[PDB]
Amino acid sequence: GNNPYSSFGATLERDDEKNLWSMPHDVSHTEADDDRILYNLIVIRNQQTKDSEEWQRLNYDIYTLRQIRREVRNRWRRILEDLGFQREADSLLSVTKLSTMSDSKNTRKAREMLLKLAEETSIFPASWELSERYLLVVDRLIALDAAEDFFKIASQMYPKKPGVPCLVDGQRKLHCLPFPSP
């Protein structure tokens, strides 16, 4: 059931009284603190039972995170596709020419996608965070038919620079169709 707990009576004298906990503990937080501190609520689960109303809320808060992922993709799909520039934005969310749908709930899987989104591409330069509401606002900008600008900015976050991996030459390709025998 519950994991082992440290014995009481430890020596706190060697440790600072203020220590690091509560709001200060949220200093190392990721760009969106709501996600990091949310998982903190899960820690309480280690202290809490399924009954626990707050930890459930952790799940419902992350679920909402799923909602941001779905709406944005629906935006990228419409901004880049209408112009045909679909590949760059595809790359950041997870639309690598892969059509995939899950009737079962993903929830946390959305956050992974957004966090990784920022690391490989940014629509606006990397110091730009991508939220569902801002992005949607940016969408209306695309409405002006100036999307090529996105490419220049999004590219600019992840431009081809030294240290790029090289594809090994000499690979053998498979025959898509059969050919006459010798």
Containing domain of residue 37, as a range? Answer: 25-157
Of 130, 129, 125, nearest to 151 (Cα)? 125
Tell me the H-state helices in 49-157.
53-83, 86-93, 109-120, 132-142, 148-157
| Cα-Cα end-to-end distance for the chain | 69
Question: Distance between CA atoms of 149 and 164, rounded to whole angstroms?
Answer: 24
Distance CA 156, CA 15 (A): 46
Give residue 114's identity as a one-letter amino acid code: L
Q: Is residue 145 part of a domain?
A: yes
Helix 53-83 with 148-157: angle, nearest 10 deg: 120
Solved using: NMR
Residue 5 lies in a domain: no
Any idea what the Cα angle at residue 120 is, between residues 83 and 66, rounded to 5°? 80
Split into its structural domains, the chain has a count of 1
Give a yes or no: residue 51 inside a domain.
yes
182 found inside a domain: no
The answer as to whether 176 is a domain residue is: no
Is there a domain that residue 59 lies in?
yes
Is residue 179 in a domain?
no
Q: Does a structural domain hold residue 11?
A: no
